[PDB]
Write a protein that binds this DNA or RNA. Structure first.
Lengths: 157, 52, 137, 238, 120
RNA sequence: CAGAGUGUAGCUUAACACAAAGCACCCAACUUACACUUAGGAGAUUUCAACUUAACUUGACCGCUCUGACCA
């Protein structure tokens, strides 16, 4: 009851993050970095996924918030080689590029040196590590292209 | 093809040894992060006293 | 009209500034474990235990039994650790537990139970039946 | 000013070039994972090709019912032979190079599976002491910038380094001997900054007496016991 | 004929019982308790006891959980406790350790369902 | 080097004895991954003499963090 000293004992929503419904990019301060995308490029699908899991678990143990873990579209490139005593290119092998991205935020400037040192020391063979600041273009690169929108935009140009 | 009793026993013991091996790897990595963090924080404190 | 609480309100120790960085329960069991401990703690408000719990005497119950036996903890612990190491060193024991075929001898367990935890469990069991309440007030 | 002398040290490190060899325990685990992967995997096109080719041979020998003559020129097993022959001809790079054999602790081509830390020899008070590269701080310059300037002051080097962060990775404070110890110059405060060696190497003018590259395990041979302890904190050997 | 504490339908677990089987599993030990509705523990069986620990290779596996049920069922018969209730969470009930423990209690003679109260 | 402090595994003012506890941690399955869940794995009283008590009391002892010496 309101007048009783036990008023408000049942309150619970002040302990819960307000969830009242794409995502705004939060730039970091002078001492903390903003949203960061940790790209993992490799020719082996297992290596890319396994290291992304390792990075995701590493951040949790380091109390670093992980915004989102997702996979970039697979790139398939044909590999052709020139035949001996010939001028014709013949297909040799097919290579698929797999990219895994782990999105983190709130990284401290002083702690960035330690975090980058640990991840680069554990990088598997054949895996490329690239850490970039999150931008709108990178997020928009995960969506299908819209030729119909482009065609209408060309008329306006 | 069904695995033999000896084959299953070998894998089970290997997995048990694998758990301890990965635990020691985490301890070495966790201590490595702690060692770097303690040194960096101590260095910053010394630097602040010398020249803010 | 408001009245200040008679004591510390629940969830007052929670820091709402760093709510995002605070570790959550994330599971039903972890919340339940904390909930059970919180319920047992005394409170300044009206509770179920106030109206239904047994009104035990605040003074400690008088012990009128034989003195407890003297046991060397250091020697007892060393022997028990040696026994465990011998048991775990057996390959068959590890295989039996891994295959979920091992079992304990009830007769051997109870014989050791009578010498270590028997007298204490009997006191608790007799307390539940109220023998001490009637025989010795 | 201050009685202590500000010094900015550079902890230049060479990242490993090759992957570390697997431990004997990891070799057992690696084989098991490969064995498990094959067991739970479906038949591949190469495997399906071999199975069908074996059946065609049976369908050509047991009964003369095959209605095709050309079939396939090369069998799956025969195709594996060509791949095997090419692999034998190709020669892989030497993981252990001539530097390891000769124990040439100056070149960067040694211990490609380990981490190398740059060490230089500097003479103080007619005494040669092995320390990390360092320079004295100057007005109008950040502490990290002094470490960057230290790289440019090396003996004919075109190395490129990638500094990580601005905060120092460690510090080392020492006092001068009482013979020359004065209130104006009580001692020095060295600050370490780590960087990654991307590309470049020293010229062939001076190699043995100028700089050495050693791992953390052998780092104690050159550093003083008090100086070694501080360096071993921010330098990892993972 | 005794009153069971009915109600508490909006919370968990229910209080409508006389004795209940409560099983506590920790990181290194497994404990099973039979306590009355008032909160008094009647009988108990824990892997911390040297009587049970000395015969177990591990005190945190299915064998330990099954062994505790066998020991507790013997103590329940010696204590006169024949009927009790079990209130598991959905994941605990589907767990293999609890199924073995429930089987041990049933094979020991203890019924995991109390008879209904006689109102007339 | 000396002096000063400190003493259960990562944390804990867990340890009356019936007992070295609780949590954190690691592998596997599930999960894109995390998380939950299930099923597993590894752990400690620095050591010793003192009602023989004693992780606890006290000494020694070993280790450990600090103040200086020492230092390029």
């Amino acid at each position: 009851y309101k007048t009783k000293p036990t008023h408000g004992i049942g309150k619970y929503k002040h302990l819960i993050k307000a969830e009242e419904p794409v995502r705004a990019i939060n730039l970091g301060t002078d001492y903390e970095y903003g949203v960061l995308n940790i790209h993992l490029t490799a020719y082996d699908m297992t290596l890319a996924e396994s290291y992304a899991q390792y990075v995701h678990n590493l951040c949790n143990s380091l109390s670093i918030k992980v915004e989102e873990s997702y996979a970039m579209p697979t790139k398939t490139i044909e590999v052709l080689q020139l035949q001996d005593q010939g001028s014709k290119m013949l297909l040799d092998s097919v290579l698929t590029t797999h990219e895994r991205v782990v999105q983190i935020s709130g990284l401290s400037a002083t702690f960035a040196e330690i975090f980058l040192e640990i991840i680069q020391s554990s990088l598997p063979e054949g895996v490329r590590l690239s850490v970039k600041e999150h931008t709108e273009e990178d997020f928009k690169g995960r969506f299908k292209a819209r030729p119909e929108l482009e065609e209408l935009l060309a008329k306006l140009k | 093809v069904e695995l033999t009793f000896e084959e299953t026993e070998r894998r089970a013991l290997l997995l048990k040894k694998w758990s301890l091996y990965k635990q020691q790897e985490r301890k070495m990595e966790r201590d490595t992060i702690r060692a770097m963090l303690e040194a960096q924080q101590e260095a910053l404190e010394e630097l602040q006293l010398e020249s803010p | 009209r408001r009245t200040p609480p008679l004591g510390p309100m629940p969830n007052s120790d929670i820091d709402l500034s760093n709510l995002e960085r605070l570790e959550k329960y994330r599971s039903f069991d972890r919340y339940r474990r904390r909930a059970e401990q919180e319920a047992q703690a005394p409170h300044w408000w009206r509770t179920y235990r106030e109206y239904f719990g047994e009104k035990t005497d605040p003074k400690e119950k008088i012990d009128i039994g034989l003195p407890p036996p003297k046991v060397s903890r250091t020697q007892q612990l060393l022997e028990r650790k040696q026994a465990i190491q011998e048991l775990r060193a057996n390959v068959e024991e590890e295989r039996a537990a891994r295959l979920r075929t091992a079992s304990v001898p009830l007769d051997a367990v109870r014989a050791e139970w009578e010498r270590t935890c028997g007298p204490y469990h009997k006191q608790r069991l007799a307390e539940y039946y109220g023998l001490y309440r009637d025989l010795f007030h | 000013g201050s009685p202590w002398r500000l010094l900015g040290a550079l902890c230049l490190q060479r990242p490993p070039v090759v992957s570390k060899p697997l431990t004997p325990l990891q070799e057992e685990m690696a084989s098991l994972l490969q064995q498990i992967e094959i067991e739970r995997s479906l038949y591949s096109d190469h495997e399906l090709r071999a199975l069908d080719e074996n059946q065609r041979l049976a369908k050509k020998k047991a009964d003369l019912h095959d209605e095709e003559d050309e079939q396939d020129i090369l069998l799956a097993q025969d195709l594996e032979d060509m791949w095997e022959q090419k692999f034998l001809q190709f020669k892989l790079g030497a993981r252990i190079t001539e530097a390891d054999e000769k124990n040439d602790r100056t070149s960067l081509n040694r211990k490609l599976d380990r981490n190398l830390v740059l060490l230089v020899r500097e003479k103080f008070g007619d005494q040669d002491v092995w320390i990390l590269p360092q320079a004295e701080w100057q007005p109008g310059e950040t502490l990290r910038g002094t470490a960057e300037r230290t790289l440019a002051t090396l003996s004919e080097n075109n190395m490129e380094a990638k500094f990580l962060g601005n905060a120092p990775c460690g510090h080392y404070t020492f006092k001068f001997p009482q013979a020359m110890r004065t209130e104006s110059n009580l001692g020095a405060k060295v600050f370490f900054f780590k960087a990654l060696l991307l590309t470049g190497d020293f010229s062939q003018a001076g190699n043995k007496g100028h700089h050495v590259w050693v791992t953390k395990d052998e780092l104690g041979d050159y550093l003083k016991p008090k100086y070694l302890a501080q360096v071993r904190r921010f330098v990892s050997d993972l | 004929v005794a009153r069971k504490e009915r109600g508490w339908r909006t919370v968990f677990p229910s209080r409508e019982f006389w004795h209940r089987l409560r099983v506590i599993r920790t990181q290194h030990h497994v404990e099973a308790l039979v306590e009355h509705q008032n909160g008094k523990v009647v009988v108990s069986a824990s892997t911390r006891e040297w009587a049970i620990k000395k015969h177990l290779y591990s005190t945190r596996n299915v064998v330990a959980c099954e062994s505790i049920g066998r020991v507790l069922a013997q103590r329940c018969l010696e204590a006169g406790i024949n009927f009790m209730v079990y209130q598991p969470t959905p994941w605990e009930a589907a767990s293999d350790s609890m199924k073995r423990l429930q089987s041990a209690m049933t094979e020991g003679g203890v019924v995991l369902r109390e008879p209904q109260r006689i109102y007339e």
